[model samples]
Each structure stands twice: as structure tokens, then as C-alpha cells.
Target chain A: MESADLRALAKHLYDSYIKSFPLTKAKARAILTGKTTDKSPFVIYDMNSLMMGEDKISKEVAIRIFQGCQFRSVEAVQEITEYAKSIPGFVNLDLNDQVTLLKYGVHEIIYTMLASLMNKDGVLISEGQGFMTREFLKSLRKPFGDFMEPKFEFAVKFNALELDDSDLAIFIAVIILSGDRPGLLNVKPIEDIQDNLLQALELQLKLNHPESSQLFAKLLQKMTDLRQIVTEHVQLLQVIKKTETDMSLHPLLQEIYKD
Target chain B: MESADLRALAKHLYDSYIKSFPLTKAKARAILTGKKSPFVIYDMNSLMMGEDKIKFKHITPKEVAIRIFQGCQFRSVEAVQEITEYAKSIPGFVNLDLNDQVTLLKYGVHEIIYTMLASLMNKDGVLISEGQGFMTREFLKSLRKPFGDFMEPKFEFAVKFNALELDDSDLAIFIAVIILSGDRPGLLNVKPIEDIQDNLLQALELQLKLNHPESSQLFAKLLQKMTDLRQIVTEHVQLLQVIKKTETDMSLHPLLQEIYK
Candidate 1:
């Protein structure tokens, strides 16, 4: 297929996929602006608990929360992989090449998911049943919880850029089709695909959000920020595997990091 | 060159580059071993609070290391010279024009130096003297004068970067990527610089695969760190630019000023 066909197909695929597993605009805006008064996930159950206010979790619960995070991230990766198959040229690549793309793309895609979970205070936990405040997360057991603080620090600001689902879908497409990832069998075709996706993203941003000239630049910077978050994620995972032997990763997530 | 030949050449280049710089092996060991002892350096005796003032002081190894590192004259000038020589030793880097070489060096040296510092730093701070001394984060931040808070941001980057657990070979090409980075402000010839960067990236990924075939994400991880490194250096340069205003006593070297500009 030609570049234009590929770009059109990519945006179409992204539109369908974003619709399939949706983040409500209210949540997205809350995540982005950190002003959660309208639809905050952190709904206090008891008035007394709200006044006594700040809640902390046990190490056991923190572990559960972390595992829940992994589970959600895995589900997002699965969705992204399924959606990539719908993109015209993605699955046309060799199995090995497809695996390479998926491997490099998952952390970024997962952080993009993480971006959706953020609010003003910190990331929401367990389908909005509760919230994991950034301060509390950092104050959790040493080493394991330390990684979250930096990631959320990036997220709080990135979410502030206030990208909508359309912007995010295009960003995810751009990330997934990255040609510069190591060990690609067909660099030129992949580069073409990414270039097309990038052009589409820029056009969409201009048409969708013409009020801000710097939105594209801010979104690009978030891509960089997402990379930093992924690095922290891997480092934390490495630390957990070494120190928290009782708590092991799911096999799929293990394979993601296991070379 | 074939992959193996490039590997051998990279190893040789790394060895030659590392040997020329007298970064203290002892301090690295201290930082690695998590040593927390205080040590005395003769230079601390004469540090001026005002003109004709002497204060007697003994400090921690990390403190000694930070003072030595901040006061370091060789790092700003000589280290750039060494790194330039090392970059020239690379096959294609020397082929760039002399003017482009200086432009790349002038614009890009701090990013490379910051990368090197990350490799050198441990959880405590950068190791300066042989296992004898360390540069603590607090001491560096305490300076609050020119080049004091300068390094705090670098220290923040270094601590996170050190978590990646990269090796010398990974580091060598990482420095090359920083040196040839296309984004460095004031470039007369970006295409040539980008070409070298692309070549270095290929070499780096190739090497990471061979050395760490078990760790597939290492290559992407390294590339990501460059972005992170660039972000840190951008913040550092911005801070330097801000400091250039309102501070008269601290004279930034012309080369350092040009880098921030």
C-alpha cells in the first residue's frame, strides 16, 4: 500500500480501537488537568475517614495494587497488539520483525495507559475504587515503591498537557510503528509507516487543537517523558525480582522484560 | 568494516579513551562499596570565606570528592580535548570538517560529560579520588554559588541513570551518540552530524545485542536514556543561562558560556 493509504488506515484503526476500550473525556481531562473536582476517582467512602483523611496501604496491599497495575498494563498491551494487526502493514512484516516491534512498543503503550489513570493527587487504583497518592507511594517500602514517584512526577505534568483520546491514539500509533527500534528486518518500510503516522498525527493535532500552537511539541515531549517512565518501570521490576521473591511477575510480563 | 572488526575497534577505542582520563579508581570502589568515611584534603584549608581567610576543616570522602570535582580545571578544558581526540579516533568522526568538529564539541561536550559522570556515580555521589573519596550530593548543592547547584540536576540524572546498570561498551557508543547528536544548537552541518549519529547507534545496538543477547531491551533502553540525558542537559543549560544573570563573582569560562548560549 502507498503511504497515504497506510496513514489513513492507521488513523481509522486508532479511532476504532480507542472506541473499543474508552477513557471517558471527564477522566481524561481530570487526568490531564489534575483538577479532579468533577469526576475524581478518589471518592471518600466515610466522612470520618475523609477528615482523618490521608490513607496508607500495607505492603501486602501495595503488592496487590502493583500486580493489578501489571494486569491492566498486560491487557493494554494485548489490545495494542490486536489493534496493530488491523493496521495495514504491521502484521505484514515477518513474525520476528513483528515481535521486535511489539517488544519495544509495549512499555511505551503501557505508560500511555498509565497516563490515563492519573489525576491531580496521584494515579487512581483498582478501577477507581480508591486512589494511590504519590506521596504515599513514595513512602511505601523502600526501593520497590521509590520508582513510582518519578514516574508519577512525569505523568502529573504530561497529563497537564491535556491531550485528548484522538491525540493519544495517534501518539500510540506513532510509538508502535517506530522504525528506529533495534533489530528491525525491514527498516525502510517501517520508517515509511512511522513517517506517515507522524504526518497524520501532526495534521490531526492541528485540525483538532488549533487553539494551541505548542500542543504538538508538548505531546512530543511527553513521548520523551514516557521513555523516562518506562526506564524507571524496568528498574523497579528488576529490583522487585531481586528483592521481592515472594511476589513474582506474571509470565507474560516476565517475558516482556526477560530477554 | 565487518561487525567483529568494528567490535574490536570499539573495544580498543574505549580502552584508549578511558586510560587518558585520570578518574579515580579508588573513589569508584568507595562509592561501589558504599563507604561513608570522612577524609582530609590539603586544599580545604585555604578555601576562602572572605579575602585572607582560612578555615580548618575535615570532610567526608563524598564532600572531598565534590569539592575537587567542582574546582576541577581539567574537566572543563582538558577533558573536552581528550573526548575530542577520542571522537576523532572513531572511523568517520575525523572525516567531518574541523569547523563542524569544534561546533559539535562546543555544543555537545556537556551532554557527553554528564553521561560520563552518570557512569561514574554511585548512589552516594560521583567517585572522585581513588577509593579514597566521593562527591556527596548535599555538598554539591550546598555550594549555591556558580557551578554549585549546577551539578545537582546532573546528580539527579546520574542517580536514575546509574540504575540502568550499563557497562563500559554500552557507555562508549552512548557517548558517541551524544557527541554526534543532531539537536545540539548552532550546527552548520546537521546532516553530517546525524549521519555519524546513525552509524554510532547501529554500532551501539549491534554491540548491545552481541554482549547482551539475553537482554533484548537493552538497546532501546540505552536510546531512551539519551533522551533522558538530553532533557537533563537542557535543564542544566537553562539553569546556567539563568545564573549568567545577577551573579558577578562567578566567571563562567567562555567555552562554558558559549555552550549555554
Candidate 2:
């Protein structure tokens, strides 16, 4: 497949795998408790952004505070400067000086979510407890957003279209799932999401989109870069698994990692 | 409730309701098909932007594009420009120059996701979805791009964090959703994103730590602006809803109402 095709396939995989799943209440609590699993982090991370207050203000929680409210309330450039003084270690970096929106909240959840989803090795699960060929409550309970299969049934139209991108059928599956939960995403009504996938596939095929080929190229390019990132930053998956094992309610004798 | 408290509560509600329930996948699709409810539309009214192979473009299909190929690949800026050329129309968007690690793909989906997660309405959804909620795939699907959502999630990271500006929680949710899908949005991820948000929150809160009353005053001043935005642009909710029923889906909301914030 071409790079564009790969990109197209990845898009559908995400739609079916992540967008349609409903996050459970249990998963949110798991995130706050620091009791992460390889799978759980991705769910919490995604939800944190779409919702307002869920986004944190800083990695250095203690260092900054504007009357106890983070920059989420900052009005203008001046207000930001007053808050900048509180940055303890990164005096030279001046990450605070910038006026970007993502930086405004000042946390790493954005990066974490992106990595978990995009990294080839990013998709991780918690033993059998994770969603494995099953969109069971056990994994859904963990609230790993995408890990849950919302069980979508595409409309007969998608089947009738004879779409060009075979991978698009998977994307249509997500539209079915999304249709089950339309308002959650603004891109389209969950109901209409499937049609878009079908239409997008047609448009893509007409142009002979190179997304699939592009992705394969990008993945190969990222390999060397990913290794470097690991050296400096701890893998979120590791943090999640460690946290889950430490917090699991092992029935006195069960091993958290036992096969 | 204090703005801070309201903001926090808003975040809590998002996780509990929208994320947890996910608004029903059937509902999501129906919104697009106008099966359950009619689709929303906010056509840019300009045909300068090249249309895709299809005759039209709408947010609905764009969002769908995001869902499937979210973290797949990162198209070069040149490629995006070329593709944009192929697309037919865009809203009042001045320049599609900023190549972003898109948080949402399908226009309708992103529009709704941005709204539902917030305590308030995205209103953009109102302008387009017409209150039944979200744009449908019937007419809007024609306008889309091949590389729209089919890029690396870390694509933004490779360039810069051209992240969306709404509530932090809302942006976070969109960012994460795009990431898990493995689209170009993953490219936005860098350790600095969390560091930036975290560190900035620390700085913002520290001003309050001084125990000075002006901090509260300043807080109010900031709240006023957010309130103004929410009140002004968002208040047109009914008009937007009304427009959804009209013949024009790409009504002037993007141009006319965008600056209301």
C-alpha cells in the first residue's frame, strides 16, 4: 500500500478502536490514583483534553499558583508574566514566555496522549484484563477509551457503496459506533460519521491519496527519533503498567503479571 | 461558583458524561445522516479553497477522516498545500497555512466533540448542526482531503504545538482522541506539552498564593473575558440552530460569528 493508504487505514483503525468507545467512570478515577496500566493511560489522556477542567495546569504543580487557579484563567500576556516567576528550574527555557494555547495550561498530557496513540509500540494492554478481541466491561471498566469496542453496525449504505479503500470499511465501523454516540465528537454526528468515511475513501481513491505510503515512510523515520526520546523521557506505558500492578486488587495470591 | 471552581467542575462533568457515555455511536452516525437528527453546517462561503474530488466539503467527513487515520502519517506542508488546492471551498479561514497535528478529523465530529466536552455548547455545532446536533454526511461529505486526518499523531510535535484554544480539558480530550487513533496528531506530542501546561498552571496559581486581593480582581478580569466570549459568540445558539434547518449549511457562522469570542 502507499503511504497515503497506510495513513487512511490508520485513520479507520482509530475511528473503530478509539473514537467510538465510551470511557467509564472507573477509568477516570484510575487516572487520578496514578494506578495506570499500559492501556489505561491513553483513555484518560484523550478525555482530559476534550473536557475543560480535566486538563492540568502544570507538571510542576507546586511551583505555580495564581490565587490557587492555574493559567486556565489567565487573561492576557501580562498575567502570564507574573505567573512565570514561579517557574523554579526552567528559568532559562522560558517555556512560559510563549503564548501558545497548549502551553497555556502547562502540562504534558497532550504529549502523552499523542505518543500513546501514534507510537507503533504505543498500544499496550493490562494482561488479560485489557480489551483483547473483546469489548468486555472488564477492560471498559478500566476506561481505556479506545480499547473498548462499542460494537458498531454500519448502515447498509456503506456496504452498498463498494468503497475503494478497503480499510475504509473499518473506518465505517467507527462511524457506526460513533453514530451510537454522536455528540461526543464534533467532527460529525456519530450517526453521520460512517458516511464521511465512505465519502472520504472515494475522494481519497479518486486522488490516489498517498497517506498509507506516507505513514510507512514516517514510521521508519521515527524509529531512530523514538529511541532518543526514550533515553530522556520515561515511557508512559511502563509507568502505567507499574502503577496498575501496584494497585491491582490481587486476590491475596494472584500475580499481577502471571500468564 | 467561582470561575476556577466552575472550570474544575466543567472538567469533571466532561469525563463523567460525554467521555463515559460517548453520546451513543448510533447517535453520532445519525447526526451525520440526519437519521436521528439533521447534520450541522458552517460553509465558509468561499470557493477559493480547492475542493476534494467531491463537489463539496463539510465538517462531517473531515471528522470521519480524523477518526480513521488520526496517527498514521505526517504529510509534508507542500503536500497539504497541494491537496488544499484540490479541495473546492473553505469558510472564512484566512490561511490554511498552519499545518497542525489535527485533534479531530471529520468537521462535524470535531465540532461536536469541542462542544459536548465543554460545560457550554461549541455553538459552532449550533451554527452547523442546527441543534439536532452535528452535520450529516448527505451533502457535506463531498468536501474532504486525503491527508486530512491521516498523518502521524506526533506530526504536531515534529513541527510545533499548534494546539486548539478552548478549555484546557477540551483541548486535552481532542488531542488524546486524535492520538489514540494514530493520526498525524500524534506528531503534536512532545514532553514540552505537558511541561508547558503544568508549569504554566504552577505560575498562574502562584499569583494567588501571594494572598493578595488583586489576584482575585485579576481573576475576575480574566473571567470577564472568558465570560464575554462564552456569552457573546455562544449566545447565538438559537440563530445557529435555526440556520441548520435552512438550505445553506455553510452559513456565515465561521466568518460572522467566529470573532464573537
Candidate 3:
């Protein structure tokens, strides 16, 4: 059909996305406490603390940390995919079209999600339980370390907008439903969906942050900045794949990043 | 009630304002069709209507046109009062400090007036005297050396603005954004004003999306027009000062004089 009702779409998107990803410490606590059974939640460690008192991280240690981070990143990619499926009209697209959007848009979405975990100093990675310092990410060797420095810069700026989960749900939806992504066969449908999401995002921002006069404009600029960060990220991943040949990359990440 | 949803608030504000002041093109056209002498055409080429060029030799056509425009400007003072009332109706607008309210209205009245003027404008000319008159571009051009320089850019901006095809609802919210702008100088309470402007801007953006879904960049383009309006208003003030010095015989409305200062 045509564009869905933005209010309903925003509500549904926020409900679905928040279910899979709890952004705040309170929400994370509720999820962990409510589960009676023993299910270990995924945890992300601070690289700075992980590398304290060490002059240089050995190749083996670096590779191991990279693999662990990649494993969690792949899990995030899956969660994002599930969230995308729940968006109104998203599942209606052809399967290949769906995959194409996810492939191109996942990195940007992940970086956007990273903002929730972020403060000026670092991001709370392990379900808001652990912290990662910005300095440590910059200290890593070329390609492996360079990947997150740009993300930290972006996250720091993105965090300044102070978008809660509701605003972000629509923002992420806009990122995935982007009509401008390469290799898209159905551009108009995607554009229609994106237009509704953008409207919803505008209303949501106004409702949520009434004091920020320039927030919407700044968010649009961040979307542009995100594309550049994603481009650099893709290139860095290629270098990691070529140089760290012994380190087995996650098959899902490999497929997503494949040329 | 505390602030309602921005969307619903915008709708209510639009509906209420349009009801009180029927200033859209349709209303203007309705009034025009009923009157026998609907259009009082101002012809710049016929400025020297009589064979008294030698009798009134000291006064040029440019000076005469300026005097006439100065008279026309007095009619706009009523619009300023209307705009102030409309602004006061905006959510959280009246809560601003008294001085801030005056400062915002001072800097923002002309922009809001020109924006509303698009409702009465076509490409060739603008409707004046409550749609009872039309002023041609050629006529406006007659006063270009003095006060008419601002008219061309305002008309150009209006024509393009009208192309957006915003109904009265969208226009209402857009005008609110202009009046509540945070960039105005000498504001005692900047934060509250910015908050009001932000809410209005979002409502306008969402309204455009609903009203004109096919035009995705319309909101951004409209924001750019706000910048253009600021520039136009600045130039207008400069030109008004020039007229103030040169046209000593011309009269300015007291309200207009205070705001322009």
C-alpha cells in the first residue's frame, strides 16, 4: 500500500526494536532480572583496561579480541535484521531487496545504536555494564584499531543529540529504508517508507526534545556523516581480512561485506 | 492541558487562525469577484498622468511613486497587530518574557507579513487593499531606485514559496516558526523561544510530509527560505532607512517606525 500511518509505524517500530535491544541500564536490568533461567548475556569489555600495563598487544591477543567483538557485532546485525522485519511494509519487499538494504545499511544502523551506549568518554558495551575508552581504540594498530576511532568521533557527536530509544527506532528505520542505497531494484517503495519514517522522526524529536531547535537539521547532517564512516569502515575491514588471514572472520560478516 | 501532540496542536492552531482571519487566496478571490471595482491598478508608466510635468517639474516620478508606496505601507500596520495576536495564540508563546515577546515580534513581523503576502500574490503582481487592488511588477519597478528594490526579491521568494502549495494549515505553522525564531537579537529568554520554534518547525515538517508526500526535500527547502527571508528583511530595513532620509515628506506609521528602529 501507500505510506503507513506514521504514529502507528513509530509506535510499532519502537516496541519491536526496544524488545530486542534495551538501551538504558534500567531496561537491561529488568531483562536480566526477569529471566529465571541461566542465559548468559553477551558482554563487551573495555579495550583500555584489557590492554593496561602492556606496551603492545600480541597478534594472538589482538586477533582473539577482534574475533570476540566480531561475534557480538554479528549478533547485533541479526538483531537489527529482526527489528527491520518488524517494521511495517519492510517484509513486503522482495527477499533480495531486503537483503540488499540490510547489507548496505547494517553498519550505519550499528553505529547509530552505538550512540545509546556512548558518553563523551566511552561507550557502555556489555549491556550497559562495561565501558570502552576512546583512547584505547585509537591506540590499536592500523586497520584493526582505526575502525572504531571514527565511530567514537561519530558516537560522541551523535550522543550530543541525546535521542532516546523511541526517536532512534524511527531514525534506524530511516537508515535501512534509504532509497539511495546501491543495487536497489525497488527504489520508490523504499523512498515511500523512508518518507513516512522521516515524518515520524520529526514529530518524535519535537515531542521528545522541545529545547533543541537545530536537532533535526543536525541529525540529517549526521546521516551524511554516517555514510562516510561506513565507507571508511568497509575499507578497514578489507585490510583486516587481507592481513589477518589466519583469523577466521565471521561468515555472516564476510557475506555482508563482500563486494 | 499541557502541550498536546505537536500534530494535533498545529491542526487546532491552523483551523482557529484561518477561521478568524480568512486571508487565503480563495477568500481574496471571493472578495474580488463580488466587487465591481475590484482591482485598483497602479501603472508605473502612467505616473505622469496629467500634462503638468512642467508645473510639477521639481518632483520626479520616482519621488511620486515613493510617496504612494509610503502611504500603502501604513495599511500594513494592521497586519502587524493581527500577526501579534496570531503569535500569542501559539503554544508556549505567551509564556516568554514580555521583552522577548516584543523583540521577536519586532524582528519577525515583516517576514511573517511577506510570507502571508504569498497568499495574495501571482507571478505578475500582488493583491493589495485586502484583495481590492493589484500592484503590477512594472509599477513596483518605478520606485526601484529608492524603496522598490526589496519588492522584486520578495515577489520572487513568494512565487517559489507558493509553488509548495501549502494550504492555510501549513502556512499557519510555518509563520509560527518564523516568529518564534531563536536567532533574533536582544532576547532576554532565548531558551523558551527556541523551544517554541523547534516544536513549530517539526510540526511544519511533518505537515509538509503529510500534505506533499512526493516532495521529500520540501521541508529543507522551506527552511532555506527562512534564511532568505531574513536577508530580505535586512535589506528592507536598509532601504527603509534610505527612504526615511530622502523622502522627508513621507509618513510612516508609528508602529512601523518603532519596529523598524
Candidate 4:
């Protein structure tokens, strides 16, 4: 509320986000400690950062889980969001962090699904899909496939190139738009945004300006119906997750209960 | 308005749809024709006997497009409504369609970008990409190295599924929503719905029963959005036609043009 608190919060956000990479737990602990005035290492380290580190695994596993499915299940996207939320941090994630997680949520799932299908499924469905499987991962693979080698190709063109700020902002909007997850909506995902960060970021201005506020709100409202197609993809994700998780469970049946 | 006119419309939907198999098209014609009279021999052939005979490209290009990005694009049920509107119809498609396309649109250009990546750049940035490319039909070929051929396989113990009553009647609302298009003060792509069935459907039905208006209108609104998505996806078919026609101009030297050729 006071200038002092605001100053502290700004400084804390600066150090944590501006300075540290999410991969480092130690730096995360330090940043977490600095984020709060009344510091409890447990809450900062154990509750938020430490748990967040584990949550990263879900994002990682979400990718793996998706790859394992070969991405056929229509519920794949929703499955990733559910699994990511199942991680402790997703529930605790601030609005900013939630958007950040969303940017990767789709990517992780798709990449993993590609890995699963490519390495496992034998029949190539489309020549394009076949090339994508072997060639899309050229940079990631140590040894390349001889048949359809990975390349720097993409249909949408720009995503294959450098990402600008507007594009980056749009990326965040999608993650929030797709999932009605815990932090965005308590239960129901609002198709029209209650929060204006999407427009704010897209236009590079805060949504507080009175002149455009009404228009901004209307834009949010109009986009709600856009959710229909999005939900279908989410449902698809669930179907895919069901298949992969089921496969994992049955194969490892004897080890299922083991710690 | 006449029976023969409706027959023509049904043929239009069926022919265009089959021509663009997997991705649905021209349901606007399917419903308009069906509502006026019985589905023509051609329309019935496409949905019933014809689709049953055809095998789906089950590995979808849309999903392939979505995966080329680094994350999931779908965000909500509404996102599902917006995106599925773009779907090309397939037999057994009610349950087969996706909801995440709305989410993908929110991300902006990733789906459009990656759909042609393999054909374009050979997927050069695999390291930066965090997820696997599953939706591409390519998964079938490399299953061993990537998905990891597990001799010990994971399986599902129980299974449950749900179904949707989606049909062309849902397009009426789309006509009402179609007013916004091509760079308005509002979002552009959603406006094509106005040209479709929504504006015409409920209007006549409205005078019949005032009591059912609430349920009728809610369904109308949803169907309208779906109509737009369908419009856009079908629009893409035309896009493919245009691109194939124009791609030579943009083709990079011989290396790239060779791919398309």
C-alpha cells in the first residue's frame, strides 16, 4: 500500500524474474526469500519455489506424457493443463507466472506427442507429418533420422523465425484463453477476460485508459465464443492423456504401488 | 427457397466436403438443403455411405499445426467453439472433432506457421521447441526412435466417453455474429458467420413460440460462433487453392520450390 512496500515488491520482482533462470532451484530460493518482507524459508522455498521445481517436472512430463500418446487423443491439451495444475505451483502461480506457464504448456505437450508417435507408431499417415516428425527435431536430436531429416521448416512462417513482443504477448493470451485452470478462473473459464493483461500486453499499454476501456471490455466479451474450438482441443488432450497414462500404468503394473 | 434449390445446396456441401476430406466443409449447404427437403442422394451418400467407405487422415493437420509451437494453444470451451467451426467434417466426426483450435488462434500464428514447417524448413529449430510434433501424419514413421518402442506397454483399465449433438442447426447464431470481419474495430476473422444460416433460422422460428425463446436463443448464439469457425476453416481450403496457385512467386530458389513440386 505504501511507497516502501511497492518499492520492495518491485525490487523483489526485478531480482527474481529479471536476474534468475527458472532452472536453478538455489537462485529461485534466494529470489523467493527476497520476494517477501516477512520471510519464511519454508513458504518461499518449500511452498513456492521448491514445489515449483517439482511442478516443472509435470510440464516436462506433460510433454513426455503427450509424446507417449502420439497425440491422437482429442483431450491432450486439457490433460497437460490438468497435469500442470496438479503440480503444486500451478494453483499458487500468480497471474503473470500462470501466463508464462501457458506459453510452454502447449509446446511441451505437442513436442512430447511427436516423440511418442514418431518413435513408436510405424505407419506414416501424411508425407507432411512424416517429415515433421523426423525433421522438426533436427536441433534437438543428436543423431538424425536418415529418411526424413529434421529441418527449419514451418507453415505459419513467423513462429519458425524470431518472436517479437506482440507475438509473445499473443502466445500468453492463448494459454490463458485455452484453459479455465484454477488461477485464471476459480472454476469456470471466462471466455471474456476479467483481467486485461492480454489487451494491455498486446497493445503495449495498461488497460486503465478510460477512452478505450469500454472497447477493450467488448473485445474480451466477443472472444468468448472462440472458446468452442479451444475446448474441443482440450477435450482431445484428455483423450490422449488417458491413452498414454493407461499404457504407462499397465506396463508397469507390478511397480505401480512402489515408492 | 424451392425444393430444387435445396437439392443444389446439398450437392454443393457434399461435393466440397468430400473434395476436402478430413477437414469439414459446406455444411451450410447440407442443413439448408436438408431442412427444405430430404437430404439428396448425394448428401446422404457423403454423410452415411460415402464417409463410412472413406478412411480418415486420422492424423490431423490442425493438431500438427498446433504442435509445431512450443505449447498448447487451446484455452476454454469457448475456444473449442471458435476453433471447431474451422474443422472440415469427417465421418464419425461429432466425437472426433477438437476444442483446442480456439486456444491455438489465441496464440496467434503458430498453427499456421508450423503446418508447413516440415515441408518448408525441415524443422530446423527442434532444440528450442519444447514439445513433440504429434498431430503431423509423420508420427507413424519414426515411432521407434522418438516414442520409444516399449516392449512393456501401458494400457487403460477402464474407458468412458461422451457425445455431442452438433449439427448444421447450430449455424443460425453464426449469421448474427458474422457482422464483424476483416479489420473492424473488433476482431475480424469471426464476422463471416453473418453470411451463413444463423440470421435466417431463429428469426422465423421466433414468432412461433415466445416461451421457448430463452433456450432457442442460447443455442442460436453458440451455433453462430461455430458457423464462423467453420467458415474460416473452409476458407482455408480456398486458401490452399490460392497458395498452390501463388506459391511459385514466394518459393525460395530451387531448394524450396523443389519441396512443393
Better of 2 and 3 by TM-score: 3
Docking class of 2: incorrect
CAPRI rating of model 4: incorrect
C-alpha lDDT values of all predictions: 0.64, 0.28, 0.70, 0.29
Better of 2 and 4 by lDDT: 4
Give the lowest summed-lDDT range of ten residues in model 1 chain A: A44-53
The total of clashing pairs for model 2 equals: 154
If scored against the real structure, what TM-score would every candidate get?
0.50, 0.18, 0.49, 0.24
lDDT of 2 by residue, A100-161 (tens): 21232212221121222121112222311222122221233332322222111111212222
Q: What tens-digit string does per-residue lDDT give for candidate 4 at A4-123? A: 543343333224322222212233233333565542222211223324433443344334323433433223444444434532224564565455445434443333222222321121
Candidate 2 recovers what fraction of true contacts? 0.00
Ranking by lDDT: 3, 1, 4, 2
lDDT of 3 at B225: 60
After superposition on all CA atoms, what RMSD does each candidate show versus the true structure?
Answer: 16.6, 26.4, 12.6, 21.0
DockQ of 4: 0.02
Error of 3 at A44 (Å): 9.8
TM-score order, best first, reads 1, 3, 4, 2
Highest-scoring model, lDDT: 3
> What's the lDDT of the predicted structure labeled candidate 3?
0.70
DockQ winner between 2 and 4, please give it: 4
Off by over 4 Å in 3: A1-5, A22-59, B1-217, B220-261
lDDT of 1 by residue, B18-54 (tens): 7655663334544566565523222334233311232
